[PDB]
Design a protein around this motif. Structure first.
Motif, PDB file in Angstrom:
ATOM      1  N   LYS A 152     -39.084  71.286  24.402  1.00  0.00           N
ATOM      2  CA  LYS A 152     -40.373  71.475  23.750  1.00  0.00           C
ATOM      3  C   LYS A 152     -40.908  72.889  23.961  1.00  0.00           C
ATOM      4  O   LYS A 152     -41.892  73.281  23.340  1.00  0.00           O
ATOM      5  CB  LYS A 152     -41.384  70.444  24.252  1.00  0.00           C
ATOM      6  CG  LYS A 152     -41.741  69.389  23.221  1.00  0.00           C
ATOM      7  CD  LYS A 152     -42.322  68.142  23.866  1.00  0.00           C
ATOM      8  CE  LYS A 152     -41.233  67.264  24.457  1.00  0.00           C
ATOM      9  NZ  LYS A 152     -41.770  66.319  25.472  1.00  0.00           N
ATOM     10  N   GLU A 153     -40.257  73.649  24.843  1.00  0.00           N
ATOM     11  CA  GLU A 153     -40.539  75.068  24.995  1.00  0.00           C
ATOM     12  C   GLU A 153     -39.669  75.943  24.109  1.00  0.00           C
ATOM     13  O   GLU A 153     -40.148  76.972  23.614  1.00  0.00           O
ATOM     14  CB  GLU A 153     -40.352  75.499  26.458  1.00  0.00           C
ATOM     15  CG  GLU A 153     -41.146  74.674  27.461  1.00  0.00           C
ATOM     16  CD  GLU A 153     -42.610  75.072  27.522  1.00  0.00           C
ATOM     17  OE1 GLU A 153     -42.894  76.272  27.710  1.00  0.00           O
ATOM     18  OE2 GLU A 153     -43.477  74.182  27.388  1.00  0.00           O
ATOM     19  N   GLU A 154     -38.411  75.556  23.892  1.00  0.00           N
ATOM     20  CA  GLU A 154     -37.576  76.248  22.919  1.00  0.00           C
ATOM     21  C   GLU A 154     -38.168  76.147  21.522  1.00  0.00           C
ATOM     22  O   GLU A 154     -38.049  77.082  20.723  1.00  0.00           O
ATOM     23  CB  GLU A 154     -36.155  75.684  22.946  1.00  0.00           C
ATOM     24  CG  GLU A 154     -35.140  76.398  22.046  1.00  0.00           C
ATOM     25  CD  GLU A 154     -34.803  77.828  22.470  1.00  0.00           C
ATOM     26  OE1 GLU A 154     -33.652  78.245  22.231  1.00  0.00           O
ATOM     27  OE2 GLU A 154     -35.666  78.540  23.021  1.00  0.00           O
ATOM     28  N   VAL A 155     -38.821  75.025  21.209  1.00  0.00           N
ATOM     29  CA  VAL A 155     -39.491  74.891  19.918  1.00  0.00           C
ATOM     30  C   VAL A 155     -40.590  75.939  19.784  1.00  0.00           C
ATOM     31  O   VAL A 155     -40.741  76.576  18.736  1.00  0.00           O
ATOM     32  CB  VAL A 155     -40.045  73.466  19.742  1.00  0.00           C
ATOM     33  CG1 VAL A 155     -40.603  73.287  18.347  1.00  0.00           C
ATOM     34  CG2 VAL A 155     -38.960  72.445  20.008  1.00  0.00           C
ATOM     35  N   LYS A 156     -41.370  76.136  20.849  1.00  0.00           N
ATOM     36  CA  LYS A 156     -42.431  77.139  20.821  1.00  0.00           C
ATOM     37  C   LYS A 156     -41.861  78.544  20.678  1.00  0.00           C
ATOM     38  O   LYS A 156     -42.389  79.367  19.918  1.00  0.00           O
ATOM     39  CB  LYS A 156     -43.291  77.030  22.080  1.00  0.00           C
ATOM     40  CG  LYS A 156     -44.020  75.707  22.222  1.00  0.00           C
ATOM     41  CD  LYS A 156     -44.291  75.385  23.681  1.00  0.00           C
ATOM     42  CE  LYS A 156     -45.594  74.623  23.856  1.00  0.00           C
ATOM     43  NZ  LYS A 156     -46.146  74.162  22.555  1.00  0.00           N
ATOM     44  N   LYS A 157     -40.779  78.843  21.403  1.00  0.00           N
ATOM     45  CA  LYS A 157     -40.159  80.161  21.284  1.00  0.00           C
ATOM     46  C   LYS A 157     -39.633  80.406  19.873  1.00  0.00           C
ATOM     47  O   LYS A 157     -39.817  81.494  19.305  1.00  0.00           O
ATOM     48  CB  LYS A 157     -39.031  80.304  22.303  1.00  0.00           C
ATOM     49  CG  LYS A 157     -39.496  80.633  23.707  1.00  0.00           C
ATOM     50  CD  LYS A 157     -38.514  81.557  24.404  1.00  0.00           C
ATOM     51  CE  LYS A 157     -38.091  82.702  23.495  1.00  0.00           C
ATOM     52  NZ  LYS A 157     -37.230  83.689  24.205  1.00  0.00           N
ATOM     53  N   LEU A 158     -38.980  79.402  19.285  1.00  0.00           N
ATOM     54  CA  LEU A 158     -38.430  79.558  17.945  1.00  0.00           C
ATOM     55  C   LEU A 158     -39.535  79.674  16.904  1.00  0.00           C
ATOM     56  O   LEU A 158     -39.400  80.424  15.932  1.00  0.00           O
ATOM     57  CB  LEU A 158     -37.497  78.392  17.627  1.00  0.00           C
ATOM     58  CG  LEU A 158     -36.196  78.378  18.430  1.00  0.00           C
ATOM     59  CD1 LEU A 158     -35.500  77.040  18.300  1.00  0.00           C
ATOM     60  CD2 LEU A 158     -35.283  79.507  17.997  1.00  0.00           C
ATOM     61  N   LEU A 159     -40.636  78.942  17.088  1.00  0.00           N
ATOM     62  CA  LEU A 159     -41.762  79.069  16.168  1.00  0.00           C
ATOM     63  C   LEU A 159     -42.415  80.441  16.280  1.00  0.00           C
ATOM     64  O   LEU A 159     -42.861  81.003  15.275  1.00  0.00           O
ATOM     65  CB  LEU A 159     -42.777  77.959  16.424  1.00  0.00           C
ATOM     66  CG  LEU A 159     -42.448  76.582  15.843  1.00  0.00           C
ATOM     67  CD1 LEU A 159     -43.401  75.537  16.390  1.00  0.00           C
ATOM     68  CD2 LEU A 159     -42.494  76.607  14.326  1.00  0.00           C
ATOM     69  N   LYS A 215     -40.750  83.171  17.035  1.00  0.00           N
ATOM     70  CA  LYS A 215     -39.820  84.033  16.308  1.00  0.00           C
ATOM     71  C   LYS A 215     -40.002  83.901  14.798  1.00  0.00           C
ATOM     72  O   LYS A 215     -39.948  84.896  14.061  1.00  0.00           O
ATOM     73  CB  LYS A 215     -38.384  83.701  16.708  1.00  0.00           C
ATOM     74  CG  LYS A 215     -37.879  84.504  17.890  1.00  0.00           C
ATOM     75  CD  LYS A 215     -36.861  83.721  18.698  1.00  0.00           C
ATOM     76  CE  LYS A 215     -36.898  84.131  20.160  1.00  0.00           C
ATOM     77  NZ  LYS A 215     -36.773  85.605  20.322  1.00  0.00           N
ATOM     78  N   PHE A 216     -40.217  82.673  14.322  1.00  0.00           N
ATOM     79  CA  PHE A 216     -40.469  82.443  12.904  1.00  0.00           C
ATOM     80  C   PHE A 216     -41.746  83.139  12.449  1.00  0.00           C
ATOM     81  O   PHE A 216     -41.790  83.719  11.358  1.00  0.00           O
ATOM     82  CB  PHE A 216     -40.542  80.939  12.634  1.00  0.00           C
ATOM     83  CG  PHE A 216     -40.567  80.580  11.178  1.00  0.00           C
ATOM     84  CD1 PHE A 216     -39.834  81.304  10.259  1.00  0.00           C
ATOM     85  CD2 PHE A 216     -41.319  79.512  10.731  1.00  0.00           C
ATOM     86  CE1 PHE A 216     -39.857  80.971   8.919  1.00  0.00           C
ATOM     87  CE2 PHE A 216     -41.345  79.177   9.393  1.00  0.00           C
ATOM     88  CZ  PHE A 216     -40.613  79.908   8.487  1.00  0.00           C
TER      89      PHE A 216
END
Ligand SMILES: [Zn+2]
Ligand SMILES: [Zn+2]
Lengths: 91, 91
Positions: free
Chosen positions: B1-8, B10-11
């Protein structure tokens, strides 16, 4: 609904005035409390259907956050454009 | 759920680059679409428990809206602030 939105814009202007007052001093709990209040105000705006006034409330929140956390040189520009948009929106 | 935040994050940085590109060619049909996408991403951030990232997304939205309306000088400053904050928050 129209009068509710106008009065909430007046409320946001008053909160912005209080934010500037708290920034001209070392008040650090007032900024947190106003940030919470302005986040609630932006949610109320977005439930009312308006998205250009919620942006103004969230912009004042952003400037308060910026000044609360050390950088008080870029919060002023956010303040200026926030008052500009709010004044354009009220009338 | 932290990788999701990092990828968002980046998006959102990619969207910021897209907005900066779309400004210098007088686009009006991509800025509104990016504003919609960024508002959705800010809502996702809010429901994901991160307020600082949602503020950056909404700052990019505000800059895109300002560029859409016609004001382009404060939009650049909003871009700088949002880009700097996202750069801090992508680590
Ligand atoms: Zn907030
Ligand atoms: Zn919006």
């Amino acid at each position: 609904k129209e009068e509710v939105k106008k009065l909430l814009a007046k409320f946001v202007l008053l909160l912005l005035e209080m934010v500037k007052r708290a920034i001209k001093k070392g008040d650090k709990e007032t900024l947190k409390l106003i940030h919470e209040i302005l986040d609630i105000i932006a949610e109320i705006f977005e439930e009312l259907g308006d998205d250009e006034l919620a942006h103004a409330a969230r912009l004042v929140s952003k400037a308060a956050e910026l000044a609360l956390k050390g950088k008080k040189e870029e919060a002023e520009k956010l303040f200026e454009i926030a008052e500009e948009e709010l004044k354009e929106l009220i009338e």
